[PDB]
Amino acid sequence: LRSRVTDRYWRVQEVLKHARHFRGRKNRCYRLAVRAVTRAFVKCTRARRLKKRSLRTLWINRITAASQEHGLKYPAFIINLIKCQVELNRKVLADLAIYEPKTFKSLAALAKRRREEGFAAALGDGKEPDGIFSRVVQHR
């Protein structure tokens, strides 16, 4: 009983459909397309992993831009926003910087105030003076 493959057209097309937009003979020749499609998929997975890092770096750059525009550095802004128990991530912070300039300026003012209170507390080394924005609110 001789058996031969009859769906090889569809087997080839299933791979060739993912390489139509390539350049050279990789979009036509099956031998050169299978290798190029596999590399394309591997790069797709790696870039899916790296997209989050790239977007986080972009958001951090935008936050640095806005903070320096408000006369404040990014590490200070972030640490003082954390100390004020404001848990807004970098994506939301960049969104506010781009689209909510007044809200971002208010956040920068709050961060600078918290930094000033921390500096004053460190200079005084006194337990009884407590900052107005340096108070910690526990879970209720």
Shortest distance (Å) from residue 72 CB to another protein: 8
Are residues 74 and 63 in contact, defined by beta-carbon separation less than 8 angstroms? yes
Shortest distance (Å) from residue 123 CB to another protein: 10
Whichever of 4 and 47 has its CB closer to another protein, that residue is 47
> Which tokens go with 129?
């003076």
Fill in the DSSP letter of residue 70. Answer: T
Q: Which residues bind another protein (CB under 8 A)?
A: 18, 20-21, 23, 38-42, 44-45, 48, 58, 61-66, 68-71, 78-79, 82-89, 91-92, 94-103, 105-106, 108-110, 112-113, 116-117, 119-120, 131-133, 135-137, 139-140
Distances (CA, A) of 136 to 23, 38, 84, 133, 139: 60, 54, 8, 8, 10
